[PDB]
Design a protein around this ligand. Structure first.
Ligand SMILES: COc1nc(C=C(CO)CO)c(C)c(OC)n1
Ligand SMILES: COc1nc(C=C(CO)CO)c(C)c(OC)n1
Lengths: 309, 307
């Protein structure tokens, strides 16, 4: 029974994730490590017209006082559903091939981002920016697919000052406020997994909210803190049950994830070797049939050819 | 482990779907069959303000030429997320309580609609109405939750004329009587039923794609996706959309469809639905506390998001 290692490189854009990944795939053998790359093609052409460009234009207009929140919200919600579609189909066709958690893997699968990037992280950041409702953020949360065994997610670390300079180097605009928001979000996320793996329970700690490594963070330091918003609160001050249930889904999805932190404050070859060492402590899985491996290989290869830049 | 029967009452709206169900929960014991009703309060207040009204005003403005198809699509996409949220959250918290396939069940759970109504059927109809992109529809399709065992879906049969009449007699808040939408939504559901049969008799969309004892691929939902937006310059579907179609195939193939004839009295419908249950597939729950956890979920849902 052959084995599989899946690794999702995620976190805020502009750190160097894409390069580092490509650098890592390059060191490997042709037929034992594949890359599912960033689907910019879907973003700029196939899915719609310059989705990246559309998003930053609308945020800028909202800030400039040129459209209202409600208007910006519907534009952001649409574009983001679109942004995330390739991650979602990929997860869906792959799911049946994944077995139980399990010596060198017969195949390593590297992903540019994980479904929560588009179904949770960026939405949450847009909400912080005032360009998306928390209800819609939670509707995205409710559609996060089941976390499969051996979900290794690598997030980035990088000083803000250096992050600002590197990013200043699609259709994007330099939105420091966005950068700050997405940085905060991925920060809460890493805390949240830690919070949940240390047996934390958002229901039991909900009142404490108001005005891989380490100890259990405070609930105020996790994603749960974002959804203490008046839109989601009943008169009695509690969360409406429907929203509570989506927080439950959030906990169920995150708690079983293996989070790793990668330092991007170094050269491109540095990040690569850092990442390589980091893989040996990652959870592998068995596949479900013998032919899962070449099948998985074709899908990843098919994807890159079509959607990678 | 104790057994569970899940029954999703679905199909196009305006046929009798709600009245019918209400008569059935009346018959069975209040603590032997539970009901998850239409989340009108979420659609009208909690998720956003008057979502139904927003949907229909927007189609109308697109029809009157007051806004662009592009503008319509974004609003439509956004609002349909809002419509589907309670369905999606419910399935997600219920899933771990569902076990394998299984004598009368320990609990019978009846829903007003299944998640594919908001993630496939309604969006597809809006696509036929020019107010949603086919990409968006496929993006919803990709997010369809996995099909758990015992997924029994009841769809309705009713001649269009009777259907028009009943829908006219019970519009929802903000809804606009629209015969194009009605024909769009009826067709989507007819294709749905045909799609399941096609799949279940071993149809393979990839094989029969060229053609664009089972239905013809041209009478399934796969025909809706020959759209030019999804095709490469040589006529092939991009692989990304092809995979969404594999997902659609996997999800639909293992659902169990039952057709309810609505062309009768509300009490006739109730009896019919009841007899329809002998062929439905039961499952085991997964934990001794699943049954009461499910009951409390249902009543909590009803209490909060019911009208
Ligand atoms: C910029 O908006 C936005 N960016 C991304 C990520 C990008 C481009 O910012 C890949 O770097 C994602 C995943 C997203 O998901 C909804 N939304
Ligand atoms: C009217 O628009 C619309 N209605 C429905 C269903 C209704 C009728 O408004 C309840 O039958 C659904 C599920 C939906 O899903 C996106 N969109």
């Amino acid at each position: 029974m052959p084995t599989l290692l899946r690794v999702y490189i995620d976190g805020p854009h502009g750190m160097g994730k894409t390069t580092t990944t490509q650098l890592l795939v390059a060191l490997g053998s042709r037929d034992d490590i594949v890359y599912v790359p960033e689907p910019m093609t879907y973003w700029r052409v196939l899915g719609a017209s310059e989705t990246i460009a559309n998003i930053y234009t609308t945020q800028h207009r909202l800030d400039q006082g040129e459209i209202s929140a409600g208007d910006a919200a519907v534009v952001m919600t649409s574009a983001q559903i679109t942004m995330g579609m390739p991650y979602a189909v990929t997860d869906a066709v792959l799911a049946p091939h994944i077995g139980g958690e399990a010596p060198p893997p017969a195949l390593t699968l590297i992903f540019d981002r994980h479904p929560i990037a588009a179904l949770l992280c960026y939405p949450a950041a847009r909400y912080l920016m005032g360009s998306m409702t928390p209800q819609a953020v939670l509707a995205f949360v409710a559609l996060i697919p089941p976390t499969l065994p051996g979900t290794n997610i690598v997030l980035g670390a990088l000083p803000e000052d250096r992050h600002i300079d590197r990013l200043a180097k699609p259709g994007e605009r330099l939105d420091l406020a966005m950068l700050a928001a997405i940085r905060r979000v991925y920060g809460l996320l890493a805390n949240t997994v830690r919070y949940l793996q240390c047996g934390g329970s958002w229901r039991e700690d909900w009142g404490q909210l108001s005005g891989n490594a380490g100890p259990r963070p405070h609930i105020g330091d996790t994603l749960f803190t974002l959804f203490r918003a008046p839109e989601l609160l009943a008169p009695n001050g509690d969360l409406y049950n429907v929203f509570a249930w989506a927080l439950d889904v959030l906990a169920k999805r995150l708690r079983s994830m293996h989070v790793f932190i990668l330092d991007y404050d170094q050269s491109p070859a540095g990040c690569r070797d850092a990442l390589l060492q980091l893989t040996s402590g990652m959870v592998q899985t068995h596949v479900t049939t013998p032919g899962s491996i070449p099948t998985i290989c074709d899908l990843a290869r098919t994807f890159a050819r079509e959607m990678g830049e």
